Write a protein that binds this ligand. Structure first.
Ligand code: MG
Ligand code: MG
Ligand code: MG
Ligand code: MG
Ligand code: ZN
Lengths: 154, 59, 305, 99, 115, 110
RNA sequence: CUAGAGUCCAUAUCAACAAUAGGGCGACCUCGAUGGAUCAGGACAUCCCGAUGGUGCAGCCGCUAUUAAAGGUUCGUUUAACGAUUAAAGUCCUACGUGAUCUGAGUUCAGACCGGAGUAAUCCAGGUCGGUUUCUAUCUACUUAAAUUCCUCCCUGUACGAAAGGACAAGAGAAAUAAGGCCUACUUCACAAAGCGCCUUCCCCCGUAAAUGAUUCUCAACUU
């Protein structure tokens, strides 16, 4: 019975689970784009999202500094988080990361995923795009929108 | 007119029809009068079934 | 040859337009049924002994403590009635049963996730599709025209009702959790036997009796609770305060109807028949309908005699 | 005191006498008035020395005079924690360690 | 709360209940179908080589709301017919014995404190 | 427990060739609009994802070569520049990465 | 069957000598692997609950009989005895019911001691200590709605009874167990699961007791 259990059982235990997530987060901070098993990416996504919120608090805030010290194994990334990532997302209130599914790796056919921070300098990923507005279905619905729009204003 | 059938003698209250549902304590025995009141056509249906050949054609 | 969903080919400028368009239509359809007594209602007959009226479908919100003037505390389940309507009526002869049936639904859901046959059935009815549909056995004089809305005022305080819903599933479980077996001692030489069922039958039969208590799935089945009274009814939010606990998890749909207990028969004499019609009512109901024994929150503190 | 309004002590001569008093008072109580309040059971029927009956606001303890001297009840209901036997008992000591 | 072989504290001033060795008597039988003793139930005590019946007034196990909870299990000794063994009660006792059905007026009369 | 009798090939065929044991046909396969290679609806195209990684790897190789040592993460933004390119008006005070290649068509410049 | 007990009195109950019925030593299969725990299925020759005759049944208790197996039939010390309870702590069948579910002893073993026999080696239906079988499920079979009981009160200290004593039926309250659910509180604990916590729980039982009435409650026609 697992009702309302929002944390996956991964690694060798609760300590190992945190350590595995921490290593993924550190690589995500340093390289700005990493690929990992799909389940591990999804679990780490929440921690990555909350890091910027602590980063927005400012480096002078002692709570954020202690949190950044634990969650960043490499100490050189702490100045980057407080002076690069946080200023970049100061106008953005959420959705700092986007997660996508990639073809399974050939080693063990595992479900693979890629997570990266928005606004990176890396070449853009082939993001899936919705249908263009010029297609037959969109044009017909657009015509319905206009005729409905002209009906209410008159 | 299967409801208005007649039994010779006391077969109405002497003859019984026993069936088992398969569950423990599931043995149920009812008399002809109880069965006829519950199902007017059960008596004729069961009588023919026992006299038909006992093969796949009976169904 | 390939599956599809509603917004697969929609552009960025069309998705919000479609989402609001169906939302506006759903609200318009729901609001068009707020006056059943003016849209050619079916004839209304006076209550008679041995008459069965239609029930309700509600959503389980939660529980709160409730006290009485006697001084005892009773827990009450919050059953909220939302978007409850009568769908279709089947006569006694057509339904080849002893009593006629009535179909009731509730908790309107999206049209994009419904079968084509279900969608067209709701299209002629002029109502958004409901999540669940239940069948209530009624008499001829208790017929209600399809499309008529229903509210929590259909019941009254001091009335005993019955609630049926699917229980909380628990998946595959052992004999100890499923049937409450005593198990085996944890020490004193026991080897891999702490939750095992043990013997299943006797050796002479050489088989296993059908219906034997065995490990397997638990829950996710329909159970009914009887003899639950109504302590309070909220008119504004259409909420029923049924005594005790009811089967099912939170935010689950529960079918409610009058109690079938023999001691509670012939108690619908003063209850609304066939249902409550707020539009045609001469007076406006109070905000909350309490029980005689229920102490109001605003009432002064109880001092016993 | 949060117990009652009136406390009554009655002395008798024989065990039948208190029983006779007990049945007489309850018979009048049930017959005379007060359908609303619940009935009252006789307490101490098997106890020959002591018998009691507790109404809604009045309680009576029918006991022999010898029991009255053994079970002194008058001072306790007039003197709270000032009784001779209550003053006789030792207070809480919380036994200490040895050597 | 109280079951077989459970140590209890005697609160009345009965000479039997006073232990010179500071040894607490333990219950040997609970007079109920399920063998579980809550406030106001009747049990049996094997104290000083004697099998004396007793009445429990308080237990450490939590009960219903607004009901006082004691940090120790308290008992009062009664005769075979209902009369208390001790003369008076010093420790506070619950008032719920009035509502409960049974012979509780004897102990309440000799009780001193209410909680 | 050991088997009592040898299972016949007729029984084994009924079990091994069961319909649920068979591989189900996938109906979520479509051609990539850009490169024309097959891809799943909910999965990124293998051809396009792999070509982005190789460019990312090349840029990251240039990142480390210009970096020249661990624990020296810059505290400024980074912008990659290709051949025949100049810093932009908004590209000031940010680390510049030089790639000895022509900017890809899919790599749109901000 | 009616000798004899039961003051009298076969047949309220008990029962002699007898008679008639029913119940579960042989070597027929196998010499090529008992106790408790848990789960119980079934019979009634009924321990408790229910209905009804008789009584040496005043009433409470009792004894005996008929019918009824839907439901229930406790926890401890020692190795059946008594300790406390209960409406009751039933008799059995089921390969010890059940060891490919588990686990004390015995049928006994490889070591040893005491008592006894034997020249000895070594033995004992005397006692004692210590002491190893395993298994991945192939097949059959199986794997999700009607409740009972105790106590207290009222009737009632009523009927009955000279007193001692002490009920029925109907109704009410409370508790326990069982079945099915739940997390508002308490608690183990915290987006949840669970109980020590809380909520709900609804049919009859045909043994006989009587009217009318022929050759009188009717394997006569008939009524309750
Ligand atoms: Mg579930
Ligand atoms: Mg019998
Ligand atoms: Mg076996
Ligand atoms: Mg349960
Ligand atoms: Zn592609």
């Amino acid at each position: 019975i697992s009702h309302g259990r929002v944390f996956r059982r991964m690694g060798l235990g609760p300590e190992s689970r945190i350590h595995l997530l921490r290593n993924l987060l550190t690589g995500l901070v340093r390289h700005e784009r990493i690929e990992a098993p799909w389940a591990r990416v999804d679990e780490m996504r929440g921690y990555a999202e909350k890091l910027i919120d602590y980063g927005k608090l400012g480096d002078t805030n002692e709570r954020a500094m202690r949190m950044a010290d634990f969650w960043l194994t490499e100490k050189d990334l702490i100045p980057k988080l407080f002076q690069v990532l946080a200023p970049r997302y100061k106008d953005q209130t959420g959705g700092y990361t986007r997660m996508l599914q990639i073809p399974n790796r050939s080693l063990d056919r595992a479900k693979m995923a890629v997570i990266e921070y928005k606004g990176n300098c890396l070449p853009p990923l082939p993001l899936p795009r919705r249908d263009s507005h010029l297609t037959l279905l969109n044009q017909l619905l657009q015509g319905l929108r206009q005729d409905l729009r002209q009906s209410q204003e008159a | 007119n299967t409801r208005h059938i007649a039994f010779s003698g006391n077969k109405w209250e002497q003859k019984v029809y026993s069936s088992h549902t398969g569950y423990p304590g599931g043995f149920r025995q009812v008399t002809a009068a109880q069965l006829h009141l519950r199902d007017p056509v059960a008596i004729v249906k069961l009588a023919i079934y026992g006299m038909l050949p006992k093969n796949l054609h009976r169904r | 040859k390939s599956g599809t969903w509603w917004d697969e080919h929609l552009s960025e400028e069309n998705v919000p337009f479609i989402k609001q368009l169906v939302s506006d239509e759903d609200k318009a359809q729901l609001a068009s049924k707020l006056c059943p007594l003016k849209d050619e209602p079916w004839p209304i007959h006076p209550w008679e002994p041995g008459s069965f009226r239609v029930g309700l479908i509600a959503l389980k919100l939660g529980m709160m403590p409730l006290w009485t003037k006697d001084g005892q505390k009773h827990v009450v389940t919050l059953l909220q009635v939302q978007d409850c309507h009568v769908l279709k009526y089947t006569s006694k002869e057509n339904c080849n049963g002893k009593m006629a049936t009535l179909s009731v639904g509730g908790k309107t859901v999206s049209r994009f996730r419904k079968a084509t046959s279900i969608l067209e059935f709701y299209r002629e009815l002029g109502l958004p599709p409901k999540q669940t549909v239940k069948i209530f056995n009624i008499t001829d004089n208790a017929a209600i025209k399809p499309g008529t809305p229903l509210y929590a005022a259909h019941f009254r305080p001091g009335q005993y009702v019955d609630v049926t819903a699917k229980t909380i599933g628990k998946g595959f479980q052992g004999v100890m959790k499923r049937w409450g077996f005593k198990g085996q001692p944890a020490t004193h030489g026991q080897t891999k036997t702490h939750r095992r069922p043990g013997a299943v039958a006797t050796g002479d039969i050489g088989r296993v009796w059908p219906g034997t208590k065995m490990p397997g799935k638990m829950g996710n089945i329909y159970r009914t609770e009887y003899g639950l009274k109504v302590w309070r009814i909220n008119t504004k939010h259409n909420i029923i305060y049924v005594n005790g606990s009811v089967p099912g998890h939170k935010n689950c749909l529960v079918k409610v109807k009058d109690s079938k207990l023999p001691a509670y028969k012939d108690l619908g004499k003063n209850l609304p028949f066939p249902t409550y019609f707020p539009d045609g009512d001469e007076e406006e109901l109070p905000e909350d309908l309490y029980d005689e024994n229920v102490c109001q929150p605003g009432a002064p503190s109880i001092t016993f005699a | 005191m949060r117990y009652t309004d009136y406390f009554v002590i009655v002395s008798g001569t024989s065990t039948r006498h208190l029983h006779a008093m007990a049945f007489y008072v309850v018979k009048m109580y049930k017959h005379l008035k007060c359908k609303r309040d619940p009935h009252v059971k006789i307490e101490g029927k098997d106890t020959d020395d002591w018998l009691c009956v507790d109404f809604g606001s009045m309680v009576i303890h029918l006991m022999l005079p010898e029991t009255r001297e053994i079970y002194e009840l008058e001072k306790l209901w007039t003197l709270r924690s000032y009784d001779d036997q209550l003053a006789q008992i030792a207070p809480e000591t919380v036994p200490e360690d040895f050597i | 709360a109280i079951q077989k072989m459970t140590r209890v504290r005697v609160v009345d001033n009965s000479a039997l209940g006073n232990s010179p060795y500071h040894r607490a008597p333990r219950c040997i039988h609970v007079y109920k179908k399920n063998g579980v003793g809550k406030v106001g139930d009747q049990i049996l005590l094997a104290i000083k080589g004697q099998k004396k019946k007793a009445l429990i007034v308080g237990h450490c196990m939590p009960g219903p709301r607004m009901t006082p909870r004691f940090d120790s299990n308290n008992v009062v000794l009664i005769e075979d017919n209902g009369n208390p063994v001790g003369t008076r009660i010093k420790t506070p006792i619950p008032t719920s014995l009035r509502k409960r059905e049974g012979e509780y007026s004897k102990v309440l009369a000799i009780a001193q404190n209410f909680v | 427990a050991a088997p009592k009798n040898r299972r016949t090939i007729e029984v084994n065929r009924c079990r091994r060739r069961n319909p649920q044991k068979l591989i189900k046909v996938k109906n979520n396969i479509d051609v990539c609009p850009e490169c024309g290679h097959l891809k799943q609806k909910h999965v990124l195209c293998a051809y396009c994802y792999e070509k982005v990684c190789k460019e990312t790897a090349e840029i990251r190789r240039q990142i480390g070569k210009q970096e020249g040592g661990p624990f020296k993460a810059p505290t400024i933004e980074t912008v990659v520049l290709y051949t025949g390119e100049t810093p932009s008006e908004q590209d000031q005070g940010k680390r510049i990465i030089e790639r000895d290649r022509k900017r890809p068509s899919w790599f749109t410049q901000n």
